[PDB]
Amino acid sequence: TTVYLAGDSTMAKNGGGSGTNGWGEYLASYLSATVVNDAVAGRSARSYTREGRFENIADVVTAGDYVIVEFGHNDGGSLSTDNGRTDCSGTGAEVCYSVYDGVNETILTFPAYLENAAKLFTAKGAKVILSSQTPNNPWETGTFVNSPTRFVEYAELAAEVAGVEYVDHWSYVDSIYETLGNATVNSYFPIDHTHTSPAGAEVVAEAFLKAVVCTGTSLKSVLTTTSFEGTCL
Ligand SMILES: *[C@@H]1O[C@H](CO)[C@@H](O[C@@H]2O[C@H](CO)[C@@H](O[C@@H]3O[C@H](CO[C@@H]4O[C@H](CO[C@H]5O[C@H](CO)[C@@H](O)[C@H](O)[C@@H]5O)[C@@H](O)[C@H](O[C@H]5O[C@H](CO)[C@@H](O)[C@H](O)[C@@H]5O)[C@@H]4O)[C@@H](O)[C@H](O)[C@@H]3O)[C@H](O)[C@H]2NC(C)=O)[C@H](O)[C@H]1NC(C)=O
Ligand SMILES: *[C@@H]1O[C@H](CO)[C@@H](O)[C@H](O)[C@H]1NC(C)=O
């Protein structure tokens, strides 16, 4: 059994550089399956699709494998000044067109990109888990602010439409950050409000596993332990 990870710098090996790391690097210790971290810094559901990265996973994934997909951090912004990451606005079959990198690109909505990827994998017999994005430092201002982005609800909507599983990674990380407090959580963000230090990445990976155990996600089958702090919800 192999577990494929698709995400951005919050999940990727080496995080966003400068001594930060991604949560995907701390999962293997807790699973009895091989973990393949295909997350890449700076990608959105759009650019990950355009670069052929979902396709690459589709080529090698087999029946029984898992694929965890988590995007959102790089999916917003303005299409007016196209950075190549921003998805088309909307929750369904809306299409946007923008010239980027020498191509008049057809751009889909965030849910559509995730639904299309889920369909490719599911048809081959893989188990897909769509996960909401992790939060930027919620204590950046000295007080706790719970402010989910639109991509948290979109990931949930996508899983529902594609018929796959959903793990609310956002809520589980924000719940543990709230309890850890201001000083500790700020220490997890060494250079900006997005990229976690190795300790923050470990806490973020544990929060994903807490969410899996609490919700009864299929990944439960390859977990080596259920001893993680925090509570269900
Ligand atoms: C929530 O938790 C945070 C983190 O624990 C609390 O903030 C810390 O509070 C302690 C105690 O008050 C501060 O420690 C003091 O620091 C001063 C020196 O002044 C400061 O210098 C810091 C270092 O600067 C360098 O490093 C930075 C990081 O790499 C870099 O960005 C700089 O360019 C520079 O190279 C600096 O981080 C700090 O900035 C903060 O304060 C400014 C106030 O004017 C503000 O503009 C800025 O946005 C930051 O908030 C400040 O310049 C020492 O003289 C003193 O002895 C003591 O060690 C510590 O600096 C704070 N850290 C941070 C990250 O803010 C915070 O109080 C808690 N919030 C609440 C509401 O409780
Ligand atoms: C991109 O393609 C769409 C649909 O084919 C078209 O309407 C639009 O004008 C094209 N963009 C440019 C800059 O030509």
Side-chain angles (χ1 to χ4, degrees):
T1 308
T2 305
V3 174
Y4 292 92
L5 308 179
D8 57 37
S9 65
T10 62
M11 182 190 279
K13 172 189 62 178
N14 292 321
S18 203
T20 63
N21 207 357
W23 76 260
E25 290 301 284
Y26 299 87
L27 252 199
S29 312
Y30 305 115
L31 307 180
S32 59
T34 302
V35 172
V36 176
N37 195 350
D38 286 333
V40 190
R43 274 55 186 176
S44 64
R46 169 188 171 195
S47 64
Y48 200 83
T49 299
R50 182 214 306 132
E51 296 176 356
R53 301 178 185 281
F54 277 135
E55 180 174 331
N56 291 331
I57 292 169
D59 285 324
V60 300
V61 74
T62 60
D65 290 338
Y66 296 83
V67 182
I68 299 165
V69 178
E70 183 180 288
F71 288 99
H73 278 279
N74 297 314
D75 292 79
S78 174
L79 223 36
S80 319
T81 54
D82 197 5
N83 69 1
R85 267 75 133 270
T86 309
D87 305 305
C88 184
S89 289
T91 62
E94 295 79 9
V95 173
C96 289
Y97 302 90
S98 170
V99 172
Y100 174 77
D101 195 43
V103 179
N104 180 6
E105 189 185 338
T106 299
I107 306 165
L108 313 185
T109 62
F110 175 88
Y113 283 120
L114 299 193
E115 283 153 26
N116 290 351
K119 290 197 293 192
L120 281 185
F121 306 141
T122 297
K124 293 187 75 168
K127 291 174 176 187
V128 181
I129 301 168
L130 300 187
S131 172
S132 52
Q133 66 162 103
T134 54
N136 280 346
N137 183 1
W139 287 102
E140 186 176 29
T141 72
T143 55
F144 186 74
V145 177
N146 198 318
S147 202
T149 64
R150 64 186 169 280
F151 305 108
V152 171
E153 173 198 87
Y154 288 2
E156 179 166 24
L157 187 239
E160 184 171 5
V161 168
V164 302
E165 297 171 283
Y166 172 64
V167 171
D168 191 357
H169 198 190
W170 169 283
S171 294
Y172 275 86
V173 176
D174 248 2
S175 167
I176 207 66
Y177 279 174
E178 185 180 20
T179 72
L180 293 174
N182 175 67
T184 299
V185 179
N186 272 294
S187 78
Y188 296 159
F189 294 89
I191 56 166
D192 55 46
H193 67 198
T194 297
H195 309 100
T196 52
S197 63
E202 167 68 37
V203 167
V204 172
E206 295 169 3
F208 178 81
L209 295 176
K210 186 70 176 187
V212 161
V213 179
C214 289
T215 78
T217 309
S218 61
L219 191 69
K220 206 183 194 68
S221 307
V222 289
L223 237 66
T224 60
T225 183
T226 60
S227 181
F228 299 108
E229 52 163 332
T231 186
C232 296
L233 298 202

